[PDB]
Amino acid sequence: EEEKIKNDMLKYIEKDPKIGVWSYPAFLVLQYLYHTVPGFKMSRTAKEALEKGLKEMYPTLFTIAEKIAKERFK
Amino acid sequence: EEEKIKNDMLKYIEKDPKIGVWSYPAFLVLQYLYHTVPGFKMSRTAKEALEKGLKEMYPTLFTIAEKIAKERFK
Incomplete structure (x- = not known):
């Protein structure tokens, strides 16, 4: 069950976590903030949005993935 | 105010709404679902997650962007 999920998720660590989204509203808001407030970390906020909504x-599953990724620290 | 936001957002329609996220938990959950349930629209669910969290x-701003993008239908 849980340990079945662990093996697959560790198989997916090996790859690059590139996630791609084609979304006009999210793109418009992110670009508006990027051009309007200096120093706006657009990618960080987009990652936060994805992580929040997906969790x-x-x-x-999000907690399992987060625990596996975190506990791969050392 | 609002009409100042409208002009910038319409300036951002012209570009491709490619949004990129580098996130190990979200990548692990999405890839687990892709490999575990057939027909899993990974990109659609990732877009939904981003839109939900960002809204x-x-x-x-998300409602303004969504209204501008929608009302650009015809």
């Missing part, structure tokens, strides 16, 4: 949709 | 963080 809300799939809380258990 | 929660910036509801007014």
Whole structure:
């Protein structure tokens, strides 16, 4: 169950976590903030948005993935 | 105010809304679902997650961007 998920998720660590989104509203808001407030970390806020929404949709899987990624610190 | 935002957002329509996220938890959950449930629209769910989280963080800007993008239908 849980340990079945762990092996697959560790198989997915090996790859680059590039995630691509084609979304006009999100792009417009992010670009507006980038051009309007200096120093706006557009990519960080987009990652936060993705992580927040995805954790809300799939809380258990998101927590498992976060624990596996974190506990791969050393 | 609002009409100042409209001009910039219409300036940003011209570009491709490619949004890129480098996030290990979100990547792990999305790839787990892609490999585990057939027909999983990974990109659609990632876009939904980004839109949900970003609308929660910036509801007014997200609604403005969504209205501008929608009302550019014809």
